[PDB]
Amino acid sequence: MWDETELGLYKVNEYVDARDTNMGAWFEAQVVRVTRKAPSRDEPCSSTSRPALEEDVIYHVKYDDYPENGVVQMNSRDVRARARTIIKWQDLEVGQVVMLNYNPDNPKERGFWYDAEISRKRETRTARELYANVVLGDDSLNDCRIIFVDEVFKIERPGE
């Protein structure tokens, strides 16, 4: 791989959210290198047959809370802008695809940050109940009870 200077959405030293593809969970990470697949010896840098696309850019990141994991190579789909905007309880709706905190092993405990589709929302004067289908690495958990209903985040998408 060669360094990429024309297509990366994030620069070296910038912080992002990066998805552990084994877990499906999102973690804050720092970009340490941006690369793309090298042209072959007989291939021009700007190729008619294989135009350069951002979806092919590889981000090398180090997790901010797991420097022990070293540098990890990330597909472009597994890196995005850091979450920042809360969707207030009153604005949550069934069908929204959001980032929220869930612990699959112990659902009443603090867990990790997953993308999820809100599946059920109910309220009484004493309880606010949120349920979502939580996306893991290679499977989804349907109808999970989400404890942390005031910490649901919008997913950052460019131009949106």
PDB file of all heavy atoms in Angstrom, residues 9-34:
ATOM      1  N   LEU A   9     -10.904  10.982   4.020  1.00  0.00           N
ATOM      2  CA  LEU A   9     -11.815  11.904   4.691  1.00  0.00           C
ATOM      3  C   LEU A   9     -11.271  12.410   6.021  1.00  0.00           C
ATOM      4  O   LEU A   9     -11.725  13.451   6.512  1.00  0.00           O
ATOM      5  CB  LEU A   9     -13.170  11.237   4.936  1.00  0.00           C
ATOM      6  CG  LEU A   9     -13.911  10.760   3.691  1.00  0.00           C
ATOM      7  CD1 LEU A   9     -15.309  10.269   4.053  1.00  0.00           C
ATOM      8  CD2 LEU A   9     -13.965  11.873   2.657  1.00  0.00           C
ATOM      9  N   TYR A  10     -10.324  11.698   6.610  1.00  0.00           N
ATOM     10  CA  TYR A  10      -9.697  12.075   7.864  1.00  0.00           C
ATOM     11  C   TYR A  10      -8.197  12.128   7.640  1.00  0.00           C
ATOM     12  O   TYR A  10      -7.656  11.380   6.822  1.00  0.00           O
ATOM     13  CB  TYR A  10     -10.054  11.069   8.960  1.00  0.00           C
ATOM     14  CG  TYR A  10     -11.411  10.458   8.714  1.00  0.00           C
ATOM     15  CD1 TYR A  10     -11.536   9.231   8.075  1.00  0.00           C
ATOM     16  CD2 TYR A  10     -12.569  11.127   9.077  1.00  0.00           C
ATOM     17  CE1 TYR A  10     -12.776   8.678   7.819  1.00  0.00           C
ATOM     18  CE2 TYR A  10     -13.821  10.579   8.828  1.00  0.00           C
ATOM     19  CZ  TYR A  10     -13.914   9.354   8.201  1.00  0.00           C
ATOM     20  OH  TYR A  10     -15.144   8.787   7.944  1.00  0.00           O
ATOM     21  N   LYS A  11      -7.527  13.031   8.341  1.00  0.00           N
ATOM     22  CA  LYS A  11      -6.090  13.187   8.184  1.00  0.00           C
ATOM     23  C   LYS A  11      -5.340  12.492   9.311  1.00  0.00           C
ATOM     24  O   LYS A  11      -5.883  12.234  10.388  1.00  0.00           O
ATOM     25  CB  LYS A  11      -5.692  14.665   8.157  1.00  0.00           C
ATOM     26  CG  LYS A  11      -6.145  15.429   6.930  1.00  0.00           C
ATOM     27  CD  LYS A  11      -5.689  16.879   7.001  1.00  0.00           C
ATOM     28  CE  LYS A  11      -4.171  16.972   7.099  1.00  0.00           C
ATOM     29  NZ  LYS A  11      -3.686  18.381   7.122  1.00  0.00           N
ATOM     30  N   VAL A  12      -4.062  12.214   9.049  1.00  0.00           N
ATOM     31  CA  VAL A  12      -3.170  11.757  10.105  1.00  0.00           C
ATOM     32  C   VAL A  12      -3.239  12.724  11.272  1.00  0.00           C
ATOM     33  O   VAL A  12      -3.222  13.947  11.088  1.00  0.00           O
ATOM     34  CB  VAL A  12      -1.735  11.613   9.567  1.00  0.00           C
ATOM     35  CG1 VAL A  12      -0.748  11.413  10.723  1.00  0.00           C
ATOM     36  CG2 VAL A  12      -1.664  10.454   8.589  1.00  0.00           C
ATOM     37  N   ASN A  13      -3.346  12.167  12.481  1.00  0.00           N
ATOM     38  CA  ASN A  13      -3.437  12.814  13.791  1.00  0.00           C
ATOM     39  C   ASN A  13      -4.874  13.162  14.164  1.00  0.00           C
ATOM     40  O   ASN A  13      -5.124  13.506  15.315  1.00  0.00           O
ATOM     41  CB  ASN A  13      -2.567  14.079  13.920  1.00  0.00           C
ATOM     42  CG  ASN A  13      -1.080  13.787  13.807  1.00  0.00           C
ATOM     43  OD1 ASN A  13      -0.640  12.647  13.974  1.00  0.00           O
ATOM     44  ND2 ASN A  13      -0.297  14.824  13.534  1.00  0.00           N
ATOM     45  N   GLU A  14      -5.828  13.068  13.239  1.00  0.00           N
ATOM     46  CA  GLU A  14      -7.203  13.405  13.573  1.00  0.00           C
ATOM     47  C   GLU A  14      -7.885  12.252  14.297  1.00  0.00           C
ATOM     48  O   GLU A  14      -7.568  11.078  14.082  1.00  0.00           O
ATOM     49  CB  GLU A  14      -7.989  13.778  12.316  1.00  0.00           C
ATOM     50  CG  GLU A  14      -7.515  15.083  11.695  1.00  0.00           C
ATOM     51  CD  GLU A  14      -8.416  15.566  10.580  1.00  0.00           C
ATOM     52  OE1 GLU A  14      -9.069  14.716   9.933  1.00  0.00           O
ATOM     53  OE2 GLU A  14      -8.468  16.796  10.350  1.00  0.00           O
ATOM     54  N   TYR A  15      -8.824  12.603  15.177  1.00  0.00           N
ATOM     55  CA  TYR A  15      -9.584  11.612  15.924  1.00  0.00           C
ATOM     56  C   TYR A  15     -10.908  11.306  15.238  1.00  0.00           C
ATOM     57  O   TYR A  15     -11.537  12.184  14.631  1.00  0.00           O
ATOM     58  CB  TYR A  15      -9.830  12.080  17.360  1.00  0.00           C
ATOM     59  CG  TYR A  15      -8.586  12.046  18.212  1.00  0.00           C
ATOM     60  CD1 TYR A  15      -7.678  13.098  18.185  1.00  0.00           C
ATOM     61  CD2 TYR A  15      -8.307  10.957  19.031  1.00  0.00           C
ATOM     62  CE1 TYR A  15      -6.529  13.075  18.956  1.00  0.00           C
ATOM     63  CE2 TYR A  15      -7.149  10.926  19.806  1.00  0.00           C
ATOM     64  CZ  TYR A  15      -6.270  11.987  19.761  1.00  0.00           C
ATOM     65  OH  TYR A  15      -5.122  11.976  20.522  1.00  0.00           O
ATOM     66  N   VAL A  16     -11.312  10.038  15.336  1.00  0.00           N
ATOM     67  CA  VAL A  16     -12.474   9.486  14.658  1.00  0.00           C
ATOM     68  C   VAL A  16     -13.117   8.476  15.594  1.00  0.00           C
ATOM     69  O   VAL A  16     -12.575   8.137  16.647  1.00  0.00           O
ATOM     70  CB  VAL A  16     -12.099   8.796  13.329  1.00  0.00           C
ATOM     71  CG1 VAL A  16     -11.502   9.789  12.337  1.00  0.00           C
ATOM     72  CG2 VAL A  16     -11.124   7.647  13.602  1.00  0.00           C
ATOM     73  N   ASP A  17     -14.288   7.990  15.193  1.00  0.00           N
ATOM     74  CA  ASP A  17     -14.861   6.779  15.760  1.00  0.00           C
ATOM     75  C   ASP A  17     -14.568   5.633  14.803  1.00  0.00           C
ATOM     76  O   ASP A  17     -14.785   5.765  13.594  1.00  0.00           O
ATOM     77  CB  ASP A  17     -16.364   6.929  15.973  1.00  0.00           C
ATOM     78  CG  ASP A  17     -16.694   7.675  17.243  1.00  0.00           C
ATOM     79  OD1 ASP A  17     -15.757   7.968  18.017  1.00  0.00           O
ATOM     80  OD2 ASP A  17     -17.890   7.975  17.456  1.00  0.00           O
ATOM     81  N   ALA A  18     -14.061   4.524  15.340  1.00  0.00           N
ATOM     82  CA  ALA A  18     -13.665   3.376  14.534  1.00  0.00           C
ATOM     83  C   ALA A  18     -14.372   2.130  15.040  1.00  0.00           C
ATOM     84  O   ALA A  18     -14.495   1.925  16.251  1.00  0.00           O
ATOM     85  CB  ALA A  18     -12.148   3.169  14.566  1.00  0.00           C
ATOM     86  N   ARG A  19     -14.827   1.296  14.108  1.00  0.00           N
ATOM     87  CA  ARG A  19     -15.630   0.126  14.441  1.00  0.00           C
ATOM     88  C   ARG A  19     -14.760  -1.125  14.489  1.00  0.00           C
ATOM     89  O   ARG A  19     -14.118  -1.478  13.495  1.00  0.00           O
ATOM     90  CB  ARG A  19     -16.768  -0.059  13.435  1.00  0.00           C
ATOM     91  CG  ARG A  19     -17.577  -1.323  13.664  1.00  0.00           C
ATOM     92  CD  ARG A  19     -18.922  -1.242  12.970  1.00  0.00           C
ATOM     93  NE  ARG A  19     -18.785  -0.809  11.585  1.00  0.00           N
ATOM     94  CZ  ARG A  19     -19.801  -0.461  10.801  1.00  0.00           C
ATOM     95  NH1 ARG A  19     -21.043  -0.500  11.263  1.00  0.00           N
ATOM     96  NH2 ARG A  19     -19.573  -0.069   9.551  1.00  0.00           N
ATOM     97  N   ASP A  20     -14.761  -1.803  15.636  1.00  0.00           N
ATOM     98  CA  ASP A  20     -14.155  -3.127  15.751  1.00  0.00           C
ATOM     99  C   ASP A  20     -15.044  -4.118  15.011  1.00  0.00           C
ATOM    100  O   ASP A  20     -16.156  -4.411  15.458  1.00  0.00           O
ATOM    101  CB  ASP A  20     -14.005  -3.496  17.227  1.00  0.00           C
ATOM    102  CG  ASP A  20     -13.411  -4.890  17.451  1.00  0.00           C
ATOM    103  OD1 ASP A  20     -13.799  -5.858  16.768  1.00  0.00           O
ATOM    104  OD2 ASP A  20     -12.551  -5.017  18.341  1.00  0.00           O
ATOM    105  N   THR A  21     -14.576  -4.627  13.869  1.00  0.00           N
ATOM    106  CA  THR A  21     -15.445  -5.462  13.046  1.00  0.00           C
ATOM    107  C   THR A  21     -15.753  -6.804  13.697  1.00  0.00           C
ATOM    108  O   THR A  21     -16.711  -7.471  13.294  1.00  0.00           O
ATOM    109  CB  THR A  21     -14.821  -5.691  11.668  1.00  0.00           C
ATOM    110  OG1 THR A  21     -13.558  -6.348  11.820  1.00  0.00           O
ATOM    111  CG2 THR A  21     -14.622  -4.364  10.949  1.00  0.00           C
ATOM    112  N   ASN A  22     -14.965  -7.216  14.690  1.00  0.00           N
ATOM    113  CA  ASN A  22     -15.271  -8.442  15.409  1.00  0.00           C
ATOM    114  C   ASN A  22     -16.409  -8.248  16.405  1.00  0.00           C
ATOM    115  O   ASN A  22     -17.199  -9.172  16.628  1.00  0.00           O
ATOM    116  CB  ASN A  22     -14.012  -8.943  16.113  1.00  0.00           C
ATOM    117  CG  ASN A  22     -12.893  -9.267  15.135  1.00  0.00           C
ATOM    118  OD1 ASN A  22     -13.116  -9.902  14.103  1.00  0.00           O
ATOM    119  ND2 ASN A  22     -11.683  -8.833  15.461  1.00  0.00           N
ATOM    120  N   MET A  23     -16.517  -7.056  16.989  1.00  0.00           N
ATOM    121  CA  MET A  23     -17.546  -6.734  17.969  1.00  0.00           C
ATOM    122  C   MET A  23     -18.733  -5.993  17.383  1.00  0.00           C
ATOM    123  O   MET A  23     -19.848  -6.130  17.899  1.00  0.00           O
ATOM    124  CB  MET A  23     -16.968  -5.857  19.084  1.00  0.00           C
ATOM    125  CG  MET A  23     -15.796  -6.448  19.834  1.00  0.00           C
ATOM    126  SD  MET A  23     -15.190  -5.224  21.009  1.00  0.00           S
ATOM    127  CE  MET A  23     -16.653  -4.942  22.004  1.00  0.00           C
ATOM    128  N   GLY A  24     -18.513  -5.187  16.346  1.00  0.00           N
ATOM    129  CA  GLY A  24     -19.499  -4.226  15.906  1.00  0.00           C
ATOM    130  C   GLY A  24     -19.538  -2.943  16.709  1.00  0.00           C
ATOM    131  O   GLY A  24     -20.322  -2.046  16.374  1.00  0.00           O
ATOM    132  N   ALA A  25     -18.722  -2.822  17.748  1.00  0.00           N
ATOM    133  CA  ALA A  25     -18.749  -1.658  18.624  1.00  0.00           C
ATOM    134  C   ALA A  25     -17.838  -0.557  18.098  1.00  0.00           C
ATOM    135  O   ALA A  25     -16.835  -0.821  17.430  1.00  0.00           O
ATOM    136  CB  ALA A  25     -18.320  -2.044  20.041  1.00  0.00           C
ATOM    137  N   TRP A  26     -18.193   0.686  18.420  1.00  0.00           N
ATOM    138  CA  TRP A  26     -17.449   1.866  17.990  1.00  0.00           C
ATOM    139  C   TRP A  26     -16.601   2.419  19.131  1.00  0.00           C
ATOM    140  O   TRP A  26     -17.065   2.518  20.271  1.00  0.00           O
ATOM    141  CB  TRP A  26     -18.413   2.944  17.487  1.00  0.00           C
ATOM    142  CG  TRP A  26     -19.103   2.579  16.213  1.00  0.00           C
ATOM    143  CD1 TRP A  26     -20.286   1.905  16.079  1.00  0.00           C
ATOM    144  CD2 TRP A  26     -18.650   2.863  14.884  1.00  0.00           C
ATOM    145  NE1 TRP A  26     -20.591   1.748  14.743  1.00  0.00           N
ATOM    146  CE2 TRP A  26     -19.606   2.334  13.993  1.00  0.00           C
ATOM    147  CE3 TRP A  26     -17.528   3.514  14.364  1.00  0.00           C
ATOM    148  CZ2 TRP A  26     -19.470   2.435  12.606  1.00  0.00           C
ATOM    149  CZ3 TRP A  26     -17.395   3.614  12.989  1.00  0.00           C
ATOM    150  CH2 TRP A  26     -18.362   3.078  12.126  1.00  0.00           C
ATOM    151  N   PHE A  27     -15.358   2.793  18.811  1.00  0.00           N
ATOM    152  CA  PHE A  27     -14.396   3.310  19.780  1.00  0.00           C
ATOM    153  C   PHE A  27     -13.703   4.544  19.219  1.00  0.00           C
ATOM    154  O   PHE A  27     -13.466   4.639  18.010  1.00  0.00           O
ATOM    155  CB  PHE A  27     -13.323   2.266  20.127  1.00  0.00           C
ATOM    156  CG  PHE A  27     -13.879   0.989  20.684  1.00  0.00           C
ATOM    157  CD1 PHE A  27     -14.244  -0.047  19.841  1.00  0.00           C
ATOM    158  CD2 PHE A  27     -14.030   0.824  22.049  1.00  0.00           C
ATOM    159  CE1 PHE A  27     -14.766  -1.226  20.354  1.00  0.00           C
ATOM    160  CE2 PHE A  27     -14.543  -0.350  22.569  1.00  0.00           C
ATOM    161  CZ  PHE A  27     -14.915  -1.375  21.720  1.00  0.00           C
ATOM    162  N   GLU A  28     -13.359   5.480  20.109  1.00  0.00           N
ATOM    163  CA  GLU A  28     -12.570   6.627  19.681  1.00  0.00           C
ATOM    164  C   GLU A  28     -11.169   6.172  19.304  1.00  0.00           C
ATOM    165  O   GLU A  28     -10.546   5.373  20.010  1.00  0.00           O
ATOM    166  CB  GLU A  28     -12.502   7.691  20.781  1.00  0.00           C
ATOM    167  CG  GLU A  28     -11.890   9.013  20.294  1.00  0.00           C
ATOM    168  CD  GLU A  28     -11.838  10.078  21.367  1.00  0.00           C
ATOM    169  OE1 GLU A  28     -12.094   9.756  22.544  1.00  0.00           O
ATOM    170  OE2 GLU A  28     -11.542  11.243  21.029  1.00  0.00           O
ATOM    171  N   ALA A  29     -10.666   6.690  18.187  1.00  0.00           N
ATOM    172  CA  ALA A  29      -9.353   6.283  17.711  1.00  0.00           C
ATOM    173  C   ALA A  29      -8.686   7.470  17.034  1.00  0.00           C
ATOM    174  O   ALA A  29      -9.343   8.438  16.649  1.00  0.00           O
ATOM    175  CB  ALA A  29      -9.460   5.075  16.770  1.00  0.00           C
ATOM    176  N   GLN A  30      -7.362   7.398  16.922  1.00  0.00           N
ATOM    177  CA  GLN A  30      -6.569   8.406  16.230  1.00  0.00           C
ATOM    178  C   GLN A  30      -6.026   7.814  14.942  1.00  0.00           C
ATOM    179  O   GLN A  30      -5.483   6.707  14.948  1.00  0.00           O
ATOM    180  CB  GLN A  30      -5.402   8.888  17.092  1.00  0.00           C
ATOM    181  CG  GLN A  30      -4.567   9.979  16.453  1.00  0.00           C
ATOM    182  CD  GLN A  30      -3.619  10.622  17.442  1.00  0.00           C
ATOM    183  OE1 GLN A  30      -2.940   9.929  18.196  1.00  0.00           O
ATOM    184  NE2 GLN A  30      -3.542  11.942  17.424  1.00  0.00           N
ATOM    185  N   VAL A  31      -6.157   8.557  13.850  1.00  0.00           N
ATOM    186  CA  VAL A  31      -5.610   8.120  12.571  1.00  0.00           C
ATOM    187  C   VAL A  31      -4.101   8.320  12.596  1.00  0.00           C
ATOM    188  O   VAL A  31      -3.618   9.408  12.924  1.00  0.00           O
ATOM    189  CB  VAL A  31      -6.251   8.898  11.414  1.00  0.00           C
ATOM    190  CG1 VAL A  31      -5.569   8.543  10.093  1.00  0.00           C
ATOM    191  CG2 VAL A  31      -7.739   8.621  11.358  1.00  0.00           C
ATOM    192  N   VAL A  32      -3.353   7.278  12.244  1.00  0.00           N
ATOM    193  CA  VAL A  32      -1.901   7.384  12.173  1.00  0.00           C
ATOM    194  C   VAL A  32      -1.360   7.218  10.762  1.00  0.00           C
ATOM    195  O   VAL A  32      -0.196   7.585  10.520  1.00  0.00           O
ATOM    196  CB  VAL A  32      -1.215   6.387  13.131  1.00  0.00           C
ATOM    197  CG1 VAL A  32      -1.688   6.642  14.561  1.00  0.00           C
ATOM    198  CG2 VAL A  32      -1.497   4.955  12.727  1.00  0.00           C
ATOM    199  N   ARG A  33      -2.145   6.695   9.824  1.00  0.00           N
ATOM    200  CA  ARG A  33      -1.731   6.612   8.431  1.00  0.00           C
ATOM    201  C   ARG A  33      -2.963   6.433   7.555  1.00  0.00           C
ATOM    202  O   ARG A  33      -3.971   5.867   7.985  1.00  0.00           O
ATOM    203  CB  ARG A  33      -0.743   5.464   8.203  1.00  0.00           C
ATOM    204  CG  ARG A  33       0.077   5.645   6.932  1.00  0.00           C
ATOM    205  CD  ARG A  33       1.161   4.592   6.775  1.00  0.00           C
ATOM    206  NE  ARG A  33       2.043   4.933   5.660  1.00  0.00           N
ATOM    207  CZ  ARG A  33       3.101   4.221   5.286  1.00  0.00           C
ATOM    208  NH1 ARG A  33       3.419   3.108   5.936  1.00  0.00           N
ATOM    209  NH2 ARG A  33       3.843   4.623   4.259  1.00  0.00           N
ATOM    210  N   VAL A  34      -2.870   6.925   6.320  1.00  0.00           N
ATOM    211  CA  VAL A  34      -3.943   6.810   5.339  1.00  0.00           C
ATOM    212  C   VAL A  34      -3.330   6.241   4.068  1.00  0.00           C
ATOM    213  O   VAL A  34      -2.410   6.844   3.509  1.00  0.00           O
ATOM    214  CB  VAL A  34      -4.607   8.170   5.056  1.00  0.00           C
ATOM    215  CG1 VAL A  34      -5.779   8.004   4.113  1.00  0.00           C
ATOM    216  CG2 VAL A  34      -5.047   8.841   6.363  1.00  0.00           C
TER     217      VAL A  34
END
